[PDB]
Amino acid sequence: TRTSVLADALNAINNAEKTGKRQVLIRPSSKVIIKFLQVMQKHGYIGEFEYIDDHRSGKIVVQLNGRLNKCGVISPRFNVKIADVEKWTANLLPARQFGYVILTTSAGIMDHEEAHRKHVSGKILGFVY
Amino acid sequence: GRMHSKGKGMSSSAIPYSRNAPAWFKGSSDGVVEQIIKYARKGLTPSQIGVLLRDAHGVTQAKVITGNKILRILKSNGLAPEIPEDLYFLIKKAVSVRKHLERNRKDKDAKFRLILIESRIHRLARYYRTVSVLPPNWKYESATASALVN
């Protein structure tokens, strides 16, 4: 079973970045994955990326900038409570400063800074530092 | 990765990118439907019907040509079996295995395989119960299974 799909997407990407591939192929590829990728793009971590409309499930081809370091998805989607956010960022990100915790909220899949600004948080998906 | 062995096969039928009809391959839809119904009348079971359509006639997948599935079509015309095709086949297999076991008292491997078959049947039974195709609190096993087959 490919239980979680976001996880799978990120893992392959991570591997690619580690080797120094400039491109990855992600097998199943959801709404969620696409949204995550968009978020990453918005802060310039990922290059262009192309979702193949398979007349089936999906397929994503990514272009890597080499600006990625580690993209992690956290295992259960812990429901997270606006103050919890701070704790998570302290744990998950290499500085009080930069990089992003990519939490899904009611307002959409944002990073963490955006969520804080918007003043809304929810479950966590990933992170990008 | 295979429901019962340690084997991890990936032999599988693929599908074409086009949901649209394959252009030149003529006939119609009505004709296809008629053919399907004829096959149903003759006693063939869904998969078999599909196979027959594909090879001899100008068929790729009934979904592409007619619009609706094979099973759906059957249901519409009211010719579909009472116990779902796969499940029925499983039951038949189980019956066969049971028969074998009756004859051969010492055949441990066969018994083991029978157990697996039974488990599979149970799974299938459960899912049919959930989607309501087998009327609830109907269990399929050893004594009544034979009766059910034919």
Binding site: S75, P76, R77, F78 | -
Partner: protein
């Protein structure tokens, strides 16, 4: 992912697993079973008074050699016959026979100390004067 369901509605399994695991840790087990009250001479107390039954020089463990000037002590509260070591330069010249004697642990969370075999406790307050005090003559013995 290794063991533990990194699940989310997983929690009961986790909690139960932890409970089950804990028992292998010694301290926790001791706390829970209540080894302190059923066994280990003292009532899980720091100090216990006992009575100097008989002075025994216990012959020490290996590399080291000597005789270790301990006391078989019968505790009052439980009635258990321990062997409590006595510190410094004799000081059995203070202990005598059939005296009330306050004992301590040794520093080893029960168990054995250094090189003295089958010994668990120091003596501190003999008859109610404390051994150190007697030895360094900062306070002195109540006659008899």
């Amino acid at each position: 992912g290794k063991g533990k369901p990194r699940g989310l509605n997983s929690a009961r399994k986790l909690r139960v697993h932890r409970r089950n695991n804990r028992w292998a840790e010694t301290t926790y087990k001791k706390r829970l079973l209540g080894t302190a009250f059923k066994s280990s001479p003292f009532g899980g107390s720091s100090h216990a008074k006992g009575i100097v039954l008989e002075k025994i020089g216990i012959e020490s463990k290996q590399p080291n050699s000597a005789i270790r000037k301990c006391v078989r002590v019968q505790l009052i509260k439980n009635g258990k016959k321990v062997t409590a070591f006595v510190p410094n330069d004799g000081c059995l010249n203070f202990v005598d026979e059939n005296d009330e004697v306050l004992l301590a642990g040794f520093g080893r969370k029960g168990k054995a100390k250094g090189d003295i075999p089958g010994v668990r406790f120091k003596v501190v307050k003999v008859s109610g004067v404390s051994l150190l005090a007697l030895w360094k003559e900062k306070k002195e013995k109540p006659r008899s």
